[PDB]
TrEMBL record:
The gene is oleP. Belongs to the cytochrome P450 family. Heme b binds at residues 90, 94, 285, 287, 343, 345. This is Cytochrome P-450. It comes from the Bacteria. SUPFAM superfamilies: Cytochrome P450 (SSF48264). It comes from Streptomyces antibioticus. Keywords: Heme, Iron, Metal-binding, Monooxygenase, Oxidoreductase. Pfam families: p450. Signal peptide: none annotated. One of its GO terms (molecular function) is oxidoreductase activity, acting on paired donors, with incorporation or reduction of molecular oxygen.
Length: 396
């Protein structure tokens, strides 16, 4: 009617729409119309407000399963989705699998992970320059890690990648196309979990099968969907972010040189590019206020929905100096690239390790790495809730 459409525009590369800085300065909480559901939502663009919306029991994701609630994606959320659970029910669900994702358990993975990266970078040198970093690194690396961690067969790669791409549709597919894929993925994962019934496994799917038979307070739907979410997230974030971080490094090649010179700066640079990159192209899973909640400039009423732009909150000038510049030497970096509060990313430590090991490996072994295709011709993924590159031809 009279509030603006969000997203504000079709995205360009990893650029933020200029309107977010305008809102952060002048209207940090504003009404928008999202592409699906009904009514309006408050768009939250500053770090302080984002930590309230993501971090407070007065903001409920369970309330977002109402199909009338505004949302960024065609299908209404279902009660069994991990994102649609509120504590304390959500806390019990994340304990099903949390143990595998602790910083300590992820750190135990670094040797296997580094070996996988090296092997895949040998396949790329064997092929010779120029080569498609998506084909040789960005896809096969995170897919192998999530397959080994869950106990999902590696030969199912093309099957679960086409499911995962459809479920991360923003505008690419219709609600019916995505609903059909959600059904297929649920039945496939329900299938993998069921193979552990008289044959237990030492992997996350084995942990999910024991929960199915022995745990009294988790529904089979919740458990199976958890397996779906881990398999989507565990490859889709890292696959895209390897392309995003390499894009940022090579298009202002000083950045890449800065890490060629001091490879020990890669962990800090991974944190800085996580802050700087809109992996989530726009918006967030929606939170609905269950009670009135005071944000910086407005009181959100019980029943009003809110949506956060993670990448805008990560450019807040009240939080980060020269927020609009990539700086691998900031003393402090309290970004929310992994979210905040209850739904804080379960895989945050695994995403960190994968980006650290892929980047460290390239910066060490490919000091001459360059983009071998025109910037203008880059195939950015269109019509998806996340951003990344379908292809990234590099030369060494
Ligand atoms: C660079 C890598 C990654 C980024 C930037 C990222 C970002 C995020 C963000 C922003 C959220 C919060 C969503 C919200 O609250 O609205 C989140 C949640 C989630 N992430 Fe990650 N993520 C990454 C890697 C991974 C990995 C490797 C996995 C799995 C192995 C994973 C699994 C999840 C899951 C299951 C959730 C939902 C958690 C819940 O609702 O309790 N992510 N991620
Ligand atoms: C509106 C944008 C968000 O998309 C959604 O909510 C999607 C419908 C999620 O259901 C997807 C399919 C799930 O698999 C997540 C577990 C993936 C995990 C990485 C995230 O939480 C991710 C940040 C996500 O919240 C955003 C892409
Ligand atoms: Na929340
Ligand atoms: Na955006």
């Amino acid at each position: 009617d009279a509030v603006p459409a969000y997203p504000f525009s079709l995205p360009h590369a990893l650029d933020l729409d200029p309107h977010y800085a305008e809102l952060r300065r002048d209207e940090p909480v504003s009404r928008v119309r999202l592409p699906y559901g009904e009514g309006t939502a408050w768009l939250v663009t500053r770090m302080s407000d984002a930590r309230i919306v993501l971090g407070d029991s007065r903001f409920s994701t369970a309330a977002a399963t109402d199909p009338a609630t505004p949302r960024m994606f065609p299908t209404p959320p279902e009660p069994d989705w991990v994102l649609a659970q509120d504590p304390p029910d959500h806390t019990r669900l994340r304990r099903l699998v949390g143990k595998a994702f602790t910083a300590r358990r992820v750190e135990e993975m670094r040797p296997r992970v580094r070996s996988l990266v090296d092997s895949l970078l040998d396949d790329m040198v064997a092929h010779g320059s120029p080569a498609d970093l998506v084909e040789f690194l960005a896809v096969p690396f995170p897919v192998a890690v999530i397959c080994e961690l869950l106990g999902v067969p590696l030969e199912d790669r093309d099957l679960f990648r086409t499911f995962s791409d459809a479920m991360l549709s923003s505008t690419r597919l219709t609600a019916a196309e995505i609903q059909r894929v959600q059904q297929d993925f649920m039945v496939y994962m329900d299938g993998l979990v069921a193979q552990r019934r008289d044959a237990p496994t030492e992997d996350l799917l084995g942990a999910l099968a024991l929960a199915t038979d022995n745990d009294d307070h988790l529904t089979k739907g919740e458990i199976v969907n958890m397996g779906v979410s881990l398999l989507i997230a565990g490859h889709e974030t890292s696959v895209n972010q390897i392309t995003n971080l390499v894009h940022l490094l090579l298009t202002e090649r000083k950045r890449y040189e800065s890490l060629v010179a001091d490879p020990a700066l890669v962990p800090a640079a991974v944190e800085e590019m996580l802050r700087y990159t809109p992996l989530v192209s726009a918006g967030s899973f929606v939170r609905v206020a269950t009670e009135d909640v005071e944000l910086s400039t407005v009181t959100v009423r019980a029943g009003e929905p809110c949506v956060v732009h993670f990448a805008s909150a990560n450019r807040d000038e009240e939080v980060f100096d020269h927020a609009d510049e990539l700086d691998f030497h900031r003393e402090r970096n309290p970004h929310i690239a992994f979210g905040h509060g209850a739904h804080h990313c379960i895989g945050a430590q695994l995403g960190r390790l994968e980006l650290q090991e892929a980047l460290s490996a390239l910066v060490r072994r490919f000091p001459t790495l360059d983009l071998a295709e025109p910037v203008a011709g880059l195939k950015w993924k269109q019509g998806m809730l996340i951003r990344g590159l379908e292809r990234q031809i590099v030369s060494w």
